[PDB]
Design a protein around this ligand. Sequence first.
Ligand SMILES: *[C@@H]1O[C@H](CO)[C@@H](O[C@@H]2O[C@H](CO)[C@@H](O)[C@H](O)[C@H]2NC(C)=O)[C@H](O)[C@H]1NC(C)=O
Ligand SMILES: *[C@@H]1O[C@H](CO)[C@@H](O[C@@H]2O[C@H](CO)[C@@H](O)[C@H](O)[C@H]2NC(C)=O)[C@H](O)[C@H]1NC(C)=O
Ligand SMILES: *[C@@H]1O[C@H](CO)[C@@H](O[C@@H]2O[C@H](CO)[C@@H](O)[C@H](O)[C@H]2NC(C)=O)[C@H](O)[C@H]1NC(C)=O
Ligand SMILES: *[C@@H]1O[C@H](CO)[C@@H](O[C@@H]2O[C@H](CO)[C@@H](O)[C@H](O)[C@H]2NC(C)=O)[C@H](O)[C@H]1NC(C)=O
Ligand SMILES: *[C@@H]1O[C@H](CO)[C@@H](O[C@@H]2O[C@H](CO)[C@@H](O)[C@H](O)[C@H]2NC(C)=O)[C@H](O)[C@H]1NC(C)=O
Ligand SMILES: *[C@@H]1O[C@H](CO)[C@@H](O[C@@H]2O[C@H](CO)[C@@H](O)[C@H](O)[C@H]2NC(C)=O)[C@H](O)[C@H]1NC(C)=O
Ligand SMILES: *[C@@H]1O[C@H](CO)[C@@H](O[C@@H]2O[C@H](CO)[C@@H](O)[C@H](O)[C@H]2NC(C)=O)[C@H](O)[C@H]1NC(C)=O
Ligand code: NAG
Ligand code: NAG
Ligand code: NAG
Ligand code: NAG
Ligand code: NAG
Ligand code: NAG
Ligand code: NAG
Ligand code: NAG
Lengths: 170, 435, 197
Amino acid sequence: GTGVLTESNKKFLPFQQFGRDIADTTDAVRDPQTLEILDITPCSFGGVSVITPGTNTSNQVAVLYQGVNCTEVSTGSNVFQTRAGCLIGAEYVNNSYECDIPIGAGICASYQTSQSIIAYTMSLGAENLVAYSNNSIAIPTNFTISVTTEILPVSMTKTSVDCTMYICGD
Amino acid sequence: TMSLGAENLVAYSNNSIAIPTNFTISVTTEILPVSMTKTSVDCTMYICGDSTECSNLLLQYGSFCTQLKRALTGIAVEQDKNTQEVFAQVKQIYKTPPIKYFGGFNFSQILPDPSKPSKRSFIEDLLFNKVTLADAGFIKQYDLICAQKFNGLTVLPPLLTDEMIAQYTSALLAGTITSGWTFGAGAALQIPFAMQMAYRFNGIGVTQNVLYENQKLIANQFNSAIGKIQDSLSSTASALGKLQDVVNHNAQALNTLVKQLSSKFGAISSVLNDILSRLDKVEAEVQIDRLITGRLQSLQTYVTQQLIRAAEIRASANLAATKMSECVLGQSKRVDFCGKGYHLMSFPQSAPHGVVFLHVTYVPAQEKNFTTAPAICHDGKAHFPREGVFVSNGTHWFVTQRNFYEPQIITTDNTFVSGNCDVVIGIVNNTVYDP
Amino acid sequence: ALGKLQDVVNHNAQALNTLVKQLSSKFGAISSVLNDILSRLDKVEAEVQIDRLITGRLQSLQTYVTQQLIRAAEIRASANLAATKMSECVLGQSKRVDFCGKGYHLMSFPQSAPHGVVFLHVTYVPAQEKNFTTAPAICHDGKAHFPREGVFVSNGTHWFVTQRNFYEPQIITTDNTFVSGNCDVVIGIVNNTVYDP
Ligand SMILES: *[C@@H]1O[C@H](CO)[C@@H](O[C@@H]2O[C@H](CO)[C@@H](O)[C@H](O)[C@H]2NC(C)=O)[C@H](O)[C@H]1NC(C)=O
Ligand SMILES: *[C@@H]1O[C@H](CO)[C@@H](O[C@@H]2O[C@H](CO)[C@@H](O)[C@H](O)[C@H]2NC(C)=O)[C@H](O)[C@H]1NC(C)=O
Ligand SMILES: *[C@@H]1O[C@H](CO)[C@@H](O[C@@H]2O[C@H](CO)[C@@H](O)[C@H](O)[C@H]2NC(C)=O)[C@H](O)[C@H]1NC(C)=O
Ligand SMILES: *[C@@H]1O[C@H](CO)[C@@H](O[C@@H]2O[C@H](CO)[C@@H](O)[C@H](O)[C@H]2NC(C)=O)[C@H](O)[C@H]1NC(C)=O
Ligand SMILES: *[C@@H]1O[C@H](CO)[C@@H](O[C@@H]2O[C@H](CO)[C@@H](O)[C@H](O)[C@H]2NC(C)=O)[C@H](O)[C@H]1NC(C)=O
Ligand SMILES: *[C@@H]1O[C@H](CO)[C@@H](O[C@@H]2O[C@H](CO)[C@@H](O)[C@H](O)[C@H]2NC(C)=O)[C@H](O)[C@H]1NC(C)=O
Ligand SMILES: *[C@@H]1O[C@H](CO)[C@@H](O[C@@H]2O[C@H](CO)[C@@H](O)[C@H](O)[C@H]2NC(C)=O)[C@H](O)[C@H]1NC(C)=O
Ligand SMILES: *[C@@H]1O[C@H](CO)[C@@H](O)[C@H](O)[C@H]1NC(C)=O
Ligand SMILES: *[C@@H]1O[C@H](CO)[C@@H](O)[C@H](O)[C@H]1NC(C)=O
Ligand SMILES: *[C@@H]1O[C@H](CO)[C@@H](O)[C@H](O)[C@H]1NC(C)=O
Ligand SMILES: *[C@@H]1O[C@H](CO)[C@@H](O)[C@H](O)[C@H]1NC(C)=O
Ligand SMILES: *[C@@H]1O[C@H](CO)[C@@H](O)[C@H](O)[C@H]1NC(C)=O
Ligand SMILES: *[C@@H]1O[C@H](CO)[C@@H](O)[C@H](O)[C@H]1NC(C)=O
Ligand SMILES: *[C@@H]1O[C@H](CO)[C@@H](O)[C@H](O)[C@H]1NC(C)=O
Ligand SMILES: *[C@@H]1O[C@H](CO)[C@@H](O)[C@H](O)[C@H]1NC(C)=O
């Protein structure tokens, strides 16, 4: 196998020699020479996603190592820690704007100005408190006739497949 | 034999009408799933964990893994779209002024509490306590989940945090309370809550003087209903059944996918390393192919089940978005759509992977028999009610509303004439007063 | 502009292209070409490879049909929604909120598009609002007068009754209002004169 061997405190009985897991993978072993218990762990791995504005715009990209602390990480000096992982190549900004490239856990990324990729907390909207009281009513004095557009799919492509021709052509 | 219900025959006749004389303000609860767990699967790690020979043999089977990954990513994006559609229906983050005199109604249990770290409400916190999440997708530093992670199955965190969902529901609630349905059309227009409730009463066919002359009773009934909602959501643990069921189904699917790795599928062993160590390349290729095919079919079944369940969740989220648009951003004339009874309003609350609507409805309470008539003859003309129904308590005739007994003397302002008194079936004789 | 329709077309085209490209996979056979297997092997030896190719391509077709069935269910739901919007927004005026566009719905106009429909929803949106002082009712001669259709407003000195969606103040008369009981119950009642025509 391949993995990291660590000292273990598992309570192996004197007759046992190895331990299994849910998927029947050996998670602990007994050293044949020095009868100690070793825990076997997968070494280290994770997903790597690439945040990028279109290649029409810029070839500069940011990288997201998903679900890892910013210590187990090509690698710029712009590391940032999101609940979704470690974000390298994005300058975190205390401002908040509308989400442009959703990264996760409320963190979004955009390409903005000397332009660079920035990461920020997405903005839900501008705050607005209603001037409410028990003898005040706001009544409109004018109107606006708006024309909105709504697009709805209706049908799709009618496809036909020749099973014999596709599988066993002539 | 199961019972459909208690039999009940309606005392019907052609000159008898039952009209309610009192009402009840009910607050029902409706739970709707919105999103599910965003899962990601590493095809190579799941099928051929750290094995070059298995990976090389897996390259033969084409692009099954790429389309499994594409399907999972599509579902993952769809979940955030569902949440955004249900909750992000408000253009601005509204908020109420510090004064909390909403015409005697007590909204303190649904408005946010600043004391808590997350600015959730009391009922929202109860809802979050009633549902336990197997995994939120957050960072897991160095179980039934470690086995999943080591085999390539991970969970992605949702784009909108629970705090953002709480802020969205707070904006919706503040807009509803301080502006009625006006914030769903254009800019929010402030209006006293008593006047907003008077409009809501007018919207179901009851005159506003009923609300104004019974304001304290209605406020007390609403407060009692909210308190009963609190008690029910704090007592019965099995309250949010649907959301917990969604979480359980996703977790069970992942656990089944992991346990499928211990199947031999006809090979000598389920462990790739044992096959590699005990057999030559020619002999081990057959066993590795069997394991690859079995695990690929298991992944296919998991993705198919996920796609069908995601379609179901998308339908539920569309329904929740419609209920937010129609029940919360306005008053609904649709029957049994925003709760049982005549709909007055609704209040949204977030919950793990779902939304909860507190539907406030008006239910007639105490009905009485009366003798009715389609029309009335005064001077050879037939008088019909402009808005209401003719009733009689035994000796005198009045005209009342159709949903609340408020009899008034039959005058020419209440009624309109149409033709003579030789056509209407069931007409009666009475005097119509002239102001 | 028409993102959804183009997305549908792209998804179908991509599915067909994937189905075609699956024909170049060996699936464990010596070759992905049927003719090469037939020419280089005897019947007994070639049957195994042909079976492997047949099984792989059959599974690929199964995946394509399953994806198509799920996507067709999605498109059918969308088409049912479009039919409902045609019935309610175009063939009539809708009271449902945010169903035929944001705002108070006036009308809608349909337009065709490749594999889809486009609705131009005409809606009415209030524009310029002003503050006013309001009151649930009014006392004239010991009776409480409530608006028949509208809301009582005041510009600072005088009291009028207006519509709820458009400021059109009118003198409070007995035709605008109706009486209900006395003036000892309503909370927030005010004092004003009701004109008698
Ligand atoms: C209501 O709004 C409309 C436009 O939103 C106003 O019409 C404009 O009036 C100004 C001043 O006379 C003109 O310069 C514009 O050309 C008009 N626009 C249009 C489209 O007609 C209208 O005056 C407003 N009414 C009130 C009472 O404020
Ligand atoms: C309508 O029903 C409500 C309650 O359903 C009645 O209010 C109750 O009245 C009794 C008698 O005065 C009190 O003891 C209760 O405390 C009241 N309850 C509440 C919640 O206020 C009301 O009296 C009924 N009205 C009519 C006309 O029957
Ligand atoms: C609205 O209801 C809440 C509770 O349902 C009220 O808060 C209670 O107030 C009493 C007296 O002030 C306290 O003894 C309780 O401990 C409070 N409970 C909670 C949970 O806060 C609140 O006072 C009500 N609102 C109004 C305006 O009366
Ligand atoms: C039906 O309602 C009428 C209207 O109130 C009743 O007539 C009144 O009865 C009371 C008895 O307490 C008298 O004091 C009033 O003078 C009566 N008014 C008129 C205009 O007649 C009548 O008694 C009711 N009848 C029944 C059977 O309930
Ligand atoms: C309602 O009143 C009318 C008029 O008072 C009644 O019509 C009378 O009916 C009797 C008997 O059929 C005739 O003799 C009269 O000539 C009718 N008068 C008129 C003016 O047409 C009618 O019968 C009454 N209805 C009831 C149910 O009592
Ligand atoms: C509120 O509206 C009333 C009604 O128009 C105003 O009263 C009028 O004010 C104008 C001033 O230009 C006078 O010419 C009229 O004679 C007044 N009419 C009456 C019946 O009094 C009043 O001034 C307005 N007040 C405010 C604060 O806007
Ligand atoms: C509205 O008008 C009524 C009647 O003009 C006022 O009622 C009077 O109140 C005073 C002070 O409480 C009493 O001394 C009078 O006897 C009352 N008159 C009547 C006929 O009841 C009432 O106070 C006024 N309301 C406001 C807010 O000014
Ligand atoms: C095994 O051999 C090693 C060295 O060859 C020795 O140090 C150790 O004590 C031995 N242990 C046993 C159980 O024989
Ligand atoms: C380049 O692509 C971006 C998409 O991020 C778009 O906003 C921009 O307008 C494009 N520019 C050109 C010149 O096509
Ligand atoms: C990362 O590890 C450090 C210690 O090595 C710890 O203090 C920190 O909380 C960790 N952060 C995350 C997000 O795991
Ligand atoms: C954001 O603000 C905090 C304090 O409010 C500060 O410590 C931090 O350096 C700021 N970040 C940036 C990128 O300026
Ligand atoms: C409005 O409510 C406040 C309590 O917050 C009260 O003091 C005030 O008198 C009320 N105004 C009217 C006009 O009733
Ligand atoms: C009601 O209908 C019955 C027939 O079932 C009839 O005999 C009776 O006269 C009717 N009552 C009135 C008031 O018309
Ligand atoms: C009306 O009278 C009938 C007569 O049998 C009775 O059954 C019914 O309960 C009464 N309805 C009400 C509301 O009292
Ligand atoms: C009404 O008055 C309040 C007082 O603060 C103000 O904030 C609000 O903008 C006013 N509304 C309108 C429509 O002018």
